[PDB]
Design a binder for this molecule. Sequence first.
Ligand code: SF4
Ligand code: SF4
Ligand code: SF4
Ligand code: SF4
Ligand code: FCO
Ligand code: FCO
Ligand code: F3S
Ligand code: F3S
Ligand SMILES: [Cl-]
Ligand SMILES: [Cl-]
Ligand SMILES: [Mg+2]
Ligand SMILES: [Mg+2]
Ligand SMILES: [Mg+2]
Ligand SMILES: [Mg+2]
Ligand SMILES: [Mg+2]
Ligand code: NI
Ligand code: NI
Lengths: 551, 551, 268, 268
Amino acid sequence: SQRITIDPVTRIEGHLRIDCEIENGVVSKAWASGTMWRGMEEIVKNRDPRDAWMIVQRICGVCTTTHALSSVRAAESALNIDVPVNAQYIRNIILAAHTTHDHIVHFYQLSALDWVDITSALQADPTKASEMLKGVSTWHLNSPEEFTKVQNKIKDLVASGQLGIFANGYWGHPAMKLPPEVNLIAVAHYLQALECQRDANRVVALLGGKTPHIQNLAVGGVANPINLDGLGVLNLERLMYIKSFIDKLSDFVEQVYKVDTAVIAAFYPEWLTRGKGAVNYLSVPEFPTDSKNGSFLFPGGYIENADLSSYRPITSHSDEYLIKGIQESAKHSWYKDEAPQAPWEGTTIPAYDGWSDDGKYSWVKSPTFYGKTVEVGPLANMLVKLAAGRESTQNKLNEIVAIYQKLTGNTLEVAQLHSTLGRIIGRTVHCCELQDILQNQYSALITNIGKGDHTTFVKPNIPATGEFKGVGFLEAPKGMLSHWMVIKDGIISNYQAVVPSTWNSGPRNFNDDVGPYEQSLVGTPVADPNKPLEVVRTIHSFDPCMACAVH
Amino acid sequence: SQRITIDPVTRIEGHLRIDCEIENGVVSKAWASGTMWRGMEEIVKNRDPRDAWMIVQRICGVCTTTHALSSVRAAESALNIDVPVNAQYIRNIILAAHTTHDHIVHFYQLSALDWVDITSALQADPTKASEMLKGVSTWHLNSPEEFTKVQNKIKDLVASGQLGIFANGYWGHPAMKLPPEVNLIAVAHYLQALECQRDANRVVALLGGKTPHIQNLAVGGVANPINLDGLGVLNLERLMYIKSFIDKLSDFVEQVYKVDTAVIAAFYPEWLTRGKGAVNYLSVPEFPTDSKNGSFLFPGGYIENADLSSYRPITSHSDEYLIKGIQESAKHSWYKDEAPQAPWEGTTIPAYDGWSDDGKYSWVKSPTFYGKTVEVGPLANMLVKLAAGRESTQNKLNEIVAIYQKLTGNTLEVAQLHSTLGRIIGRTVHCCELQDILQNQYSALITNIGKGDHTTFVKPNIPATGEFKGVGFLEAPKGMLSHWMVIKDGIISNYQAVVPSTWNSGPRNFNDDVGPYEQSLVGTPVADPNKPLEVVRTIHSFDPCMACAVH
Amino acid sequence: PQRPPVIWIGAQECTGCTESLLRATHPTVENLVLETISLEYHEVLSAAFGHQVEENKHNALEKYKGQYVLVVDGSIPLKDNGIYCMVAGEPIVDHIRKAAEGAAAIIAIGSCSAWGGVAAAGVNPTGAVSLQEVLPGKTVINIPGCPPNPHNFLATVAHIITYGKPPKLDDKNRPTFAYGRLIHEHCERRPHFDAGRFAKEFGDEGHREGWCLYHLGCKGPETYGNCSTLQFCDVGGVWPVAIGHPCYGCNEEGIGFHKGIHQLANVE
Amino acid sequence: PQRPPVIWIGAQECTGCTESLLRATHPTVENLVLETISLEYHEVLSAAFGHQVEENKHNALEKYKGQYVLVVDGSIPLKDNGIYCMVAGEPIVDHIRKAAEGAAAIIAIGSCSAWGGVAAAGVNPTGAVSLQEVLPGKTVINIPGCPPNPHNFLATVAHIITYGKPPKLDDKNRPTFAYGRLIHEHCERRPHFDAGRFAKEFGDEGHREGWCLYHLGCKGPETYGNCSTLQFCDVGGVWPVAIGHPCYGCNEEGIGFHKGIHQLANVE
Ligand code: SF4
Ligand code: SF4
Ligand code: SF4
Ligand code: SF4
Ligand code: FCO
Ligand code: FCO
Ligand code: F3S
Ligand code: F3S
Ligand SMILES: [Cl-]
Ligand SMILES: [Cl-]
Ligand SMILES: [Mg+2]
Ligand SMILES: [Mg+2]
Ligand SMILES: [Mg+2]
Ligand SMILES: [Mg+2]
Ligand SMILES: [Mg+2]
Ligand code: NI
Ligand code: NI
């Protein structure tokens, strides 16, 4: 057996260490470790419930917006507040546009350099590269002339001898399978992606007041003042400007990101057969559209032992079965209290004692659902929507499979989605379906304002005595998020965040069972143990966020 | 034979009527008429000299900036003020960026639909259209996919039955010579041009305070406050933002506009043999770079009888030879005083009496230079630079000729430039050379601020007695512009504008000699006198501006 | 899918009000003409000229009677029987009155058509008047400025299309979302005015720190508009005061084109 | 030509300060890394990981000794001998002190590195401190905000590259072009403050007219920054107060993450 350490894992958010035991060039056992803690649950304690969202938003700036929205939903749950419909439309537009930026950047800026060899791109013929995409995409920026300009920018960076963040990369590795032409196409799309994500964030900015870290929320609704005839407020001119950026996102998403997802699968088909992290999956419904915090545009649910046919739907953020099942343990984490804890009764008492293979090895806690390990995120979200019979999701997956079938002659079955590439496909399907969420909610807001409803905010009252509890659910870019608030004598007496990367990255649990990252790595081939690219490929497919996982 | 009227001429600035006698299928005689007057010279009279530029800027909003800059130069001339060099760099960047917008919009939005048949573009094969440009342009937006998206926009407009401003055009006319594929290329480039001109105007806005109609000038310099370390003023962050837009203009200008100019000439070569308006040409030097209102980046001069070898250089805006030669007559114009007038002694007394072929028929005056008719604008400007031996101008013209040679197997000589297509080529050459002016002047400004010079404004004094005469020259997009101010007892006692479209569009003069628009039309073949497209093609090549011509 | 029709007529215009559309972003001018409206008459962009384009105007006024929005830039000159602006041999006042008969809505874009503007200033050589003066029995929507931000116009047209009526207007028929407040009652340099921190000349130390421009002649205290908030060109931070020059009052009748640049404003 | 080298190390960061660069326009992040600088170490974007990326850090620190700009986001935790942020088996404070020895310039990007920020608030579970506290012999340039506008950072780096020295700084080592004035001393809602025109609750009539946010808890009177003028995202009109929410004081130690959203500011 050999032992390796990967520290730091780069092209993620935050601070992660991965250790592996390797037997005869195959991973036999793995450890995931979050190596940085802040204590954000303790920082927010003993404050007014109204203040929490501005503080806990700073759990993460990659998944900005998400902890802000979960925190106001948690306070509204505790206080029994129904959010105005206009405030829901505005919250929904921000979450959908933010998630579009987040997925694009993950596929291109964070993940592509696991699969793409920039030096190989220098050998490409730009005309042959453009001809490969004929009848496969209708994108307007796949010409030989575009690809030549990109190739020349690579040539100039290499000729300078200053490769910087493109240095000491995995150029020529035996696991790099793309021809030179496909490597050049991918670099061109990497650069083009940066323009599309910028337009998604211009949507977010116009409603949030800036991004990163929006500033338009409140316990009770939003701070945007709706008045079509007002100077200096959210009027028709401002709404038209928002729409101009919404309309700029679809072509890149559909004609570049969707297509590249199918192409990567066509060249790497063994990655349909490895990287399974779990047999149970959870997602929450998202994008409420009624006056009572419900009527979601996207469905949620729980799948057990990979059986889509007998899954359990979740249609409410007040679902008592969902609420009662969630616990976290610190047996193998650096905290004092080890037995599983419901989050309203949670503690976060630091107890660092260094690394032990069989003891404590991470700042991440270990979440369970009625005692089981569960994967969250885009693979869970896609599987639940297929289990629900959602035609939009079926049809989108089928468009990816059709391009894969044109290139390989083969189809994809659902069994092949429980894998590293299935996880990537689920994230692309999500990004595509979010473009119609944007159109739908922009139209709903225009229509509602036209009926005379300009309402945005319900002012809270917070009893000065008594002890009461709330929970705010949200389907974040990395999966199901929950914030858990206890109020006593008008101030926060307990605050616990259970975050999607906590579910996926957490260490061995109270029963010593293995969570998704650690389980996904068993069986990984490693051609060169000094350069374990294959391990990083599977870990990146989960889109790790360690500021989120640990907080 | 018969007599026709074209009223209104469209795809110009302002209100123009053109009359033609046709005999044996060719124009034998023509009349040009400006049909709207405001009296801008009288509106500005009796005011403080410092106020004039904000009023007379409103002579024209197509050539915005130009009358503002000519007016401050005229007051500075009268008062003997030396403008700070930083104020010159800022004025120069504004004029060069504005002129880039102005020429792009002229070639595409105003002139292209004289030469391009939008209906024929529906018959094009997009792949064959993209193949035609291989080895001819490196532009990144010439793909079959781009061209198919544009074709589908035309198909949708036609299918709606609402063609609006694209209706009742000259579709199928015998003078329409492009193949379907080249019509589709041109429509794609028309749409792309709108993005490039928007970037050019972002440069203007960041220094001017808005556009149309800048608001940063003063008699004595500019209103921009230079302070790299100041909040709310022109600091390094604001200068970086200006540079980000300057850098966006070159590729479209070099790879699209310059290439299209050569392609139009290749398909319409007989248009190199008609449309000569004059044998005399004038331009003024432009873009001063010293501390004393001189050291121009572009040269000026006077060509007599088309002889480049014996031209007279003009290197100063104080040149007494230039100043003493300029007069205007109203013999054939709707004003009372008819003898030629030097502009410091000019009058503008309205005397409308209706149209007469041998009497008065326009609101435009008739300018002369030492008693001769003269063409101004891009053809004049190019020919004077070639006479001066300017290698940059030689080289840029040679690039256009080399594309024409590759397409036709024929070359282009200077004699062929005295024509409708030569005029178009001069405009394109100017737009290309202006991109180097922007890079040069941005660099000069950064370097001078770094030497510790932040000066921008010299406060004027205006004596309360005495009579002072000043003249401000400027090389505008349409040609040499001059504003002539007389100051007496501290106020404006006379104000006269002599504008480049006045030179080209003015009617028969005191000696009944014909000006450039009327001369250019003699010999024009007209296949259909009800639909005189051939006449409009030659007139558009001068880029008429009738708000400018008449004021 | 059919697009709402628009007829655009220029009288004594400089073309700056049309050129503002070429800076617009929401919609861009190409999206305006292909997606938002059907532009049935506009001489700056029309393929057809002369008799063909006058045929096209006649046919559109008939086809679309009671449905189209009429837009006018420039003042309308009444002196000497209308001869200071003649198109196809007839005074522009006659073209405008005939188009007004069948209009669903009528907009004066820019200070010239809204109140006479620069072309009616000084001695008023041509007897230039406003669009509302030529059409006394009609409600004219005024969108002043020289030229206005194009979205002050485009969001007015969008309100008519989307919600079936004009935006709320003030007592000068100006949309309140754009003209409802004095510039000085929503200006970022108000703290410096309050503290007596004034630029005295361009390039002086206070000017170079971004202080108030009142003593340079700023007309913000007497001009209604949205120049300090909406600003210009959608780049961020761009309006005359932010660049370093006083407001001249170009929105406001009796201020712009009447008062000197350096003449002081009255403060309420 | 060769490009100026930059080393970027994250401590107790949320990544929002890196993410600000993905909104920038002058330069865009792609032009930053290909044209303006050579980004020699940045874990968010690096192709290399693990042992390879630590070797390339060591090689760059040697090659570029005396020449590189060191940038840090996040607070630095001193409690329990540095163990609350461990990279490659060592406390992050040790990696930062080693990299500081050879730096030509040192920048704390964001409130966390500038003064401790949210991570050092309340009970301060990890004994989080600022970059300047860890490097007492060095001049640290502070660029606060949560996160700042990215150009407050990018124009500081440009001044170093173009003119060979840092921009002018205040007595907290903040660049004057971005932090030299209180938000309330350059706010477009100051006329409303002066007149007693206040929003009382979100969605009320004054809120829906763009009135002053003082009585909602606005911290503009006690916060230095450029949020009202430079604003955010280069689209025009976008900062918290313009969208309808008070300033929280995120730039300023003792205001953001300490005072409640609706707690009133002290006025000078
Ligand atoms: S309002 Fe101003 S920009 Fe518009 S036509 Fe009149 S002078 Fe020109
Ligand atoms: S006088 Fe002008 S610059 Fe000063 S506060 Fe008023 S509007 Fe702003
Ligand atoms: S300053 Fe704010 S955005 Fe930057 S690391 Fe700290 S919490 Fe994140
Ligand atoms: S309290 Fe806030 S909103 Fe009011 S004027 Fe001051 S900074 Fe502006
Ligand atoms: N998405 C996201 Fe961040 C993580 N993991 C949260 O919630
Ligand atoms: N260019 C331009 Fe206008 C005209 N003719 C002026 O001067
Ligand atoms: S001059 Fe005009 S554009 Fe605005 S700043 Fe003043 S009303
Ligand atoms: S909360 Fe922060 S981003 Fe600016 S508006 Fe206030 S300093
Ligand atoms: Cl409303
Ligand atoms: Cl300076
Ligand atoms: Mg509830
Ligand atoms: Mg937690
Ligand atoms: Mg002086
Ligand atoms: Mg004149
Ligand atoms: Mg009459
Ligand atoms: Ni996150
Ligand atoms: Ni003009």
